[PDB]
Design a binder for this molecule. Structure first.
Ligand SMILES: Cc1cc2nc3c(=O)[nH]c(=O)nc-3n(C[C@H](O)[C@H](O)[C@H](O)COP(=O)(O)OP(=O)(O)OC[C@H]3O[C@@H](n4cnc5c(N)ncnc54)[C@H](O)[C@@H]3O)c2cc1C
Lengths: 980, 977
């Protein structure tokens, strides 16, 4: 709209004029922070070092930690920038000063005092309470009580404050209309287990605390704003706002933050306004662009989710202006807080409101305390109604907040950087962002092999979606209509029934029988081996691209059944919703990845370059593969091992674990739907005590793929090494065995991240993973604090049936597992000291308490033996060297983790913490195909890594054909010949 | 320069007149009105068709049944509609007849007399398949004698061709009427510069017999020149024969202008003739083996002996022709070329130098370049046709070579008569063409290292290489009698248990005494290796690779010395010994590069906020248990692979090759390898064998040797003992029972010597050796007769004497075991050949060939590891493949066949680790032939290939969440926005 746009541009021009060249302190090159940010902006390596240093800074609580980190992040004094122990003191004082710039105080009393100073300078405030991530109920209560404490202090003071001057209205209110007390609350800080996987439980827990705060706010006629956090919780937070509003439909001073950088926001704003109209209530919206842009883009890309944010910056600006116009048009029902430091954005809001003649009591402006100083002052001068978002509290979360402000101010796309560091042209700065979008989209308008798209991991289940949340109960219900079947063997394309049946039951409810499984004797296993051996010649002679096509069809068949296949796993083996879905996506990943790997490896390659000669190097299968699969990843690992053997040209005799035989039957369904030729895949569940050695010992077996315990793996290795009469090959072992995996918690670890990652690593799926954290090795000086937070978080979780998404973990695999694990828990309780032992439900189910035991040392049994259940050992290391020594003190070497923000300690861990899969600053479980090829050596395996580029070669043997191409003195000349 | 321009003008003007007098007349091969011209036309337009057609003509004479013929036609040319029996046969046969003067002596003689009446002289050549036996050499020799007897009776009635003066009974008044050419290698089936003196004498003795008959007729004998391999031998034959008959003027030699050596060879021969005051004759040619020499040199890292720009050969010809003409007083000249420029250049140079006509003549091959031949007759008058005669079988091979000559891209005939090239380009001074082509031609390794190339094989065309072996064998003999200690943690450790090591061809010759490690010493070595491991593991992969490169240079500098040790200690022939050392060098160079390639962590996945790096780590202590049959090569390959990947090695050489094992100590010491990284512990298997394999500090075992021992090791290594860190990794190369299939259509000239070498090279003591030859029913009798006849020509004796084909086997135990197997085989089949062996000491087993062998027989199944070859008669090709696949082994295999269908079937179904087509099945080279198989022949590990180093390591992944406080560094390969 050209005329309006011209007014906006002129308003912006007047604004830049009234600023008089003033730079915000962060861009003041005369100040230390300005020099620091200037160099960060010119030098990306320095920015990364400086910003990461500020992040770790509040953990550097001794002189040694501090001195060492300074050297590790910035190098020696001679190699540092000019603007930078005396060095300890100067750096410390400058960083602390930077953080204080952005906070109104450290105590409630100080905050209140400083808020009054702000009022005398003409500024209103919205107060926020700084806090570390809420990891427990006790922490949520502290946060809640801090708001209550703040409100009580403000209640006593506000009567003595003259209201900020306005043009009309009520002289006891700010600008004649706004409540003097205004606070903002982060909803997820009110509940440590906030998760849309438990949508209702999360809404209620947050709502119950928000209600308590809100009641006190109303008691002093104040305003409560509910802030918006990451996209993961956006729908939860919207629902919290809607419920609290309907509980107090007549109270006007309740706001919600909406983020214009979200593609969803056009619909969300429209829905909320329509909702307010329908319910005949009023609302208030603080429109922001959004604070988590890099996080959302990374998180979505890590999970093959649609990126929920716009990714061209002008799109967020254009969305803001569009959505602000929508709000202002609806001022009758919607009060507006314009929260932005962008002069174009601010100018657009001002002129749109003027054009729509919106009453001034329906819109105000907000900025963050301590930044964009000239912008703040310009708003005061032109609009008069300006509120500062003012955090207060402890310096530890204050440093985290500081880093976020530094990121915001120094971003390449930041309006503040462009205006105040980069000398950007005013006309460009104030351009209609809609025009910017068109130009940027047009600019941006200007790989796989063999016609196949490149490999990408299958999208994870996404419980931000109502449809994904609804799918599970529906599919679990459908599965229940299918219970009670008898599952036969499947051999040479035919169903073969035996009369030895073993029931398979729900571990969370053993009275619920899912079905009966036929058991193969040695006769039937021998039959299956015979069928596989007979199908082998034609299958080996099938083109690798064709073999790969069967895997691609199986992947599509599985993809079309994703929630159904997932539901079976929830009931048969007690997978939580996310765990079950991830099992199926991983199976799909193996199929898509191994299909592409065979296509890659399937072409004979010329080796050497001598003329008159062609050497071609290529691979052939081995023969019949025995595949012996675990129950803990019943589709993923089964499908991975079987499909690798199949795509490489082998034929498979497959023994699923008894308690997940139905999931094993899914392989039959999937390969049959793909049209796999008869005998290439044979399904023979059976009693190991009857046919286990028989399968491994058989002369017609050429390879054995096994995943499971070390004891069984080692027995297989010993027996397989013998060559019996009639045996064609030396048997090839592909084996993934157990682990006793440690995560190290260094002194400088970010405990907000370390704690929930350790909890998930230890207790996700009841701890039943070869990759699970069973030892947490914690540095002396952070031990007490770490353990308090871990135990408190554990106490908040619930143990119960996996079909109920409210439960964190549930029953273990079967009766034998429960008894074994419980015995290990008793052993550990006599070795160390019990720190936590959860309640479990009464009645039936193979429940083992979520168990945490401290005081564990390397010489203890539960520091050495794989328990495969929810029993976590906590070990206290005297220094980092001992932490590493202890991590390396078992016979296993599968996975490991380290939380540390020390370059030197991370380097030492990369080199010396010699596990097959080492994870830095995140959980040590959940390895993905291609990204984390999985497996190790020592007693954890034989160095084969599933889901990686070396895996398929283990299922084959290389061959070379060498041809003398010269006849009667001449040879064809080939493209890669070394010629003349 | 000014003179150069002037003479070039006369040459160009002579060429222009030569062409003007031809005017549209084409050689019959370029006659597109004929079937021959049509087939060649399409060959020149379509290289794929050329390859099919020329290969078909090559295989054509083996197509002896209606089945063979019909199937080959389809396999080479496709269905009878995708193309461009009795008929196609007549066309190819007519094509071959164009180039030969007859099929019998009498027909040849009649046709030669006809040619005389048409004014053409001749030089007569006898066609033949390759000489593979003494009997064949005698047949070839007697055919010349027969020819000469026939000509002797006729020549008296021949009027000499007209000339300008002289003797009316001689051609042109001066040339002998009878002139024959002989191929020297056809006189000796084992001609080979590795036995230089033996080859010269055997050839000379037959050539002298022919020459005496030639002299009786007062005729001319030309000694033809063959491939570069035999050039020096042939020169020496000519020189000796000339001096035996210093006064007889009618003896010629061919010299090849396409050889870089020829400038010097011609200078040398001319100076030699002067010194000895004799006269000579030279037929100067460009050369017939160009493609072969180029390929052969490139295959062996030898300097290519031929010029590789065609104009360079032309330029060399004109340069060398001038030199001969300058020397006309002592050197008679035959200009042998179909090239009008070349011929015109010679005519003008003869005029410039005023050379008498009786000192030069012109020669062309019968049946080609007809207008060129006609032109020479008209202008010069002295033209002689090279006139081969004989059997259609070698006639077809000759046909192929002529078709190649005529249709080559750079052929002067093709450009003149097919391409309608501009006459100015055709008659250009080739020296100018050279400069232009060089200028145009004037207009990758990694980490700064050159790319890998296999080390050059020993080259016995060189006098220095021939002389080096006797020199170095003698030098090694001055160093015998030493006591060899263990080498543990950088220190020499003696023990009281000594085992002598002796020469298998002369067991009374003791090379030294070897200390034996007890379990105590082996445990000490393992402890040393274990202590050295953490620092070695942490050494940069590039640095570890540098040690291997230093060791490779150390070995390269000692090549002949290291070779000589093997000749004496284990009975390697000179070439076998040198090849063992070059293979060792190759492993070092190749594994160094492989570790450099594999040594850098690679990002995997592309998700942002995350870095996954995938990389490799060594395992720990490796036991390396090495064979005696490739005592440096395989030992060094296994040890250096383990070492470069970051492991430390405890190495047990075979007892009988312990000194070669010591060479590893010497080489790693010279490279400066850190102490403990390589330890040398020879010892008695019965004392410390199981100890070494069972030890809990061993993480890897690299073994090469017998199936029986390999299988025992695999079984024992599977157990995890108390304190054992890893499941032990096996890298194992075991035996074979390798077959070569001889198909009905096999080229027996190649199949026979390749099979003989595959079976008996190094006494058959190779895991890759051919111990079964499976021969198709219809070619059985023919193949076996030639194979046995070639075998009979070879001698068994000490490997230090290069005259011997093979020698003693490794030791007394091997001899006893192999002889028992021979007796078993003789009761199972029937002996076709059993060689004499020397009297007296030495572990000699006869070169033994046994027929009537079937898959149920023990010697069709069990690896003998000695000079015992089973011959098996297959009823059809399907059974041949079935039989090839009938053992428990699958290491190597070979097939001789010119059937695309059968070759395709073999590629698919003959499932050995290394299958060879139309060559021997031994001698695998690093990178070109990564070596190893499965079944009972190994565990699918392939030494010398790109999958090998990974077996000595385990992969690791480090995954880092790079996001802190909502931000992460953006990395280049991130999936982003
Ligand atoms: C008082 C106040 C309260 C706030 N409360 C919250 C809250 O509860 N929740 C929340 O999420 N944020 C909140 N914010 C917003 C956030 O903290 C930033 O301050 C704000 O987004 C910066 O925008 P801008 O108009 O100041 O600056 P600009 O430089 O104009 O805009 C920058 C913004 O654009 C977006 N952006 C950057 N790059 C791209 C890109 N490549 N593609 C698309 N978009 C891009 C980001 O949102 C970034 O923050 C609040 C802001 C204020 C002032």
């Amino acid at each position: 709209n050209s005329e309006l746009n011209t007014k906006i541009v002129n308003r912006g021009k007047e604004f830049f004029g009234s600023i008089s060249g003033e730079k915000p302190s962060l861009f003041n090159k005369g100040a230390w922070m300005g020099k620091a940010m200037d160099w960060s902006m010119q030098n990306e390596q320095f920015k990364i070092q400086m910003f990461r240093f500020v992040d770790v800074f509040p953990s550097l609580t001794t002189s040694k930690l501090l001195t060492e980190h300074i050297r590790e992040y910035f190098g020696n004094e001679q190699d540092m920038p000019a603007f930078m122990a005396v060095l300890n003191k100067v750096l410390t004082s400058n960083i602390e000063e930077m953080a204080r710039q952005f906070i109104v105080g450290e105590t409630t009393k100080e905050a209140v005092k400083n808020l009054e100073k702000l009022r005398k300078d003409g500024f209103a405030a919205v107060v926020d309470v700084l806090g570390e991530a809420t990891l427990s109920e006790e922490e949520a209560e502290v946060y809640t009580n801090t708001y209550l404490e703040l409100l009580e202090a403000l209640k006593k003071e506000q009567g003595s404050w003259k209201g900020l001057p306005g043009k009309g209205g009520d002289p006891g209110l700010d600008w004649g209309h706004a409540p003097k007390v205004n606070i903002a609350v982060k909803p997820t800080a009110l509940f440590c287990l906030a998760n849309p996987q438990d949508f209702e439980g999360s809404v209620v827990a947050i709502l119950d605390r928000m209600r308590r705060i809100f009641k006190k706010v109303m008691e002093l006629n104040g305003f409560l704003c509910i802030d918006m956090e990451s996209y993961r919780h956006k729908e939860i937070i919207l629902e919290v706002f809607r419920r609290l509003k309907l509980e107090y439909r007549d109270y006007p001073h309740l706001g919600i933050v909406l983020q214009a950088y979200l593609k969803d926001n056009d619909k969300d704003l429209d829905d909320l306004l329509a909702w307010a109209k329908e319910h005949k209530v009023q609302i208030s919206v603080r429109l922001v662009k959004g604070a988590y842009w890099d996080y959302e883009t990374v998180k979505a890309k890590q999970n093959d989710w649609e990126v929920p944010v716009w990714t061209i910056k002008a799109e967020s600006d254009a969305a803001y202006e569009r959505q602000a116009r929508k709000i202002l048009e609806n001022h009758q029902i919607c009060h507006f807080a314009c929260a932005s430091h962008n002069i174009r954005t601010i100018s657009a809001v001002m002129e749109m409101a003027r054009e729509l003649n919106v009453p001034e009591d329906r819109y105000e402006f907000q900025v963050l305390y301590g930044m964009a100083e000239p912008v703040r002052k310009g708003i005061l001068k032109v609009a008069g109604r300006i509120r500062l978002y003012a955090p207060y509290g402890n310096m530890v979360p204050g440093m985290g907040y500081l880093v976020r402000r530094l990121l915001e101010n120094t971003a390449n796309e930041s309006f503040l950087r462009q205006s105040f560091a980069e000398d950007a042209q005013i006309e460009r700065l104030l351009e209609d962002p809609a025009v910017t979008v068109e130009r940027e989209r047009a600019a941006r308008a200007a790989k796989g092999l063999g016609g196949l798209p490149p490999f990408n991991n299958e999208a994870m289940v996404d419980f931000t979606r109502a449809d994904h949340r609804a799918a599970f109960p529906k599919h679990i219900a459908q599965v229940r209509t299918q219970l009670g079947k008898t599952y036969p063997l499947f051999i040479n394309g035919k169903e073969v029934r035996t009369n030895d049946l073993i029931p398979t039951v729900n571990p969370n409810k053993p009275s619920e029988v899912l079905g009966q499984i036929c058991q193969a004797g040695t006769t039937e296993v021998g039959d299956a081996i015979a069928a596989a051996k007979a199908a082998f010649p034609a299958w080996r002679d099938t083109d690798p691209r064709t073999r790969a096509e069967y895997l691609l069809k199986a992947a599509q068949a599985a993809r079309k059944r994703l929630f159904e296949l997932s539901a079976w796993q929830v009931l048969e083996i007690g997978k939580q919703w996310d765990q079950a879905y991830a099992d199926v996506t991983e199976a799909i990943d193996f199929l898509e990845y191994y299909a592409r790997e065979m296509i890659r490896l399937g072409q004979p390659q010329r080796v050497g370059h001598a003329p008159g000669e062609l050497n071609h190097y290529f691979y052939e299968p081995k023969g019949v593969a025995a595949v012996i699969a675990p129950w803990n990843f019943p589709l993923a690992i089964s499908m991975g091992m079987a499909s690798a053997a199949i795509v490489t040209g082998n034929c498979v005799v497959f023994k699923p674990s008894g308690i997940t035989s139905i999931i094993g039957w899914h392989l039959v369904e999937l390969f049959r739907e793909a049209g796999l030729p008869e005998g290439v895949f044979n399904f023979t569940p059976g009693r190991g005590s009857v046919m286990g050695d028989y399968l491994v010992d058989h002369p017609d077996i050429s390879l054995i793929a096994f995943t499971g315990s070390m004891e069984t793996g080692l027995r297989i290795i010993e027996r397989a090494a013998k060559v019996h009469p009639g045996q064609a090959n030396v048997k090839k072992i592909i084996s993934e065995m157990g682990g006793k995996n440690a995560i190290i918690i260094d002194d400088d670890a970010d405990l907000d991240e370390a704690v929930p990652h350790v909890l998930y690593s230890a207790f996700g799926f009841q701890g039943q993973k070869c990759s699970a954290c069973s030892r947490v090795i914690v540095l002396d000086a952070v031990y007490d604090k770490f353990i308090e937070r871990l135990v408190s978080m554990a106490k908040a979780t619930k143990v119960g049936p996996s079909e109920d998404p409210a439960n964190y973990m549930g029953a273990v695999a079967d009766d034998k597992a429960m008894k074994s694990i419980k015995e290990y828990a008793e052993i550990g309780k006599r070795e160390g000291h019990v720190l936590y032992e959860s309640p479990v439900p009464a009645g039936e189910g193979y429940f083992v308490p979520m168990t945490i035991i401290g005081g564990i040392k390397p010489e203890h049994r539960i520091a050495q033996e794989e328990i495969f259940g929810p029993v976590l050992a906590v070990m206290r290391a005297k220094d980092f060297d001992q932490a590493i020594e202890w991590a390396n003190s078992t016979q296993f070497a599968l996975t490991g983790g380290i939380f540390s923000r020390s370059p030197e300690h991370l380097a030492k861990a990369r080199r010396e913490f010699r596990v097959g899969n080492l994870y830095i600053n995140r959980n040590n479980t959940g390895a993905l195909v291609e990204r984390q090829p999985f497996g190790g050596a020592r007693m954890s395996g034989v160095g084969t890594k599933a889901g990686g580029p070396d895996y398929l070669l283990h299922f084959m043997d290389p061959r070379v054909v060498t041809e003398n191409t010269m006849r009667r003195g001449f040879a064809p000349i080939e493209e890669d010949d070394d010629w003349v």
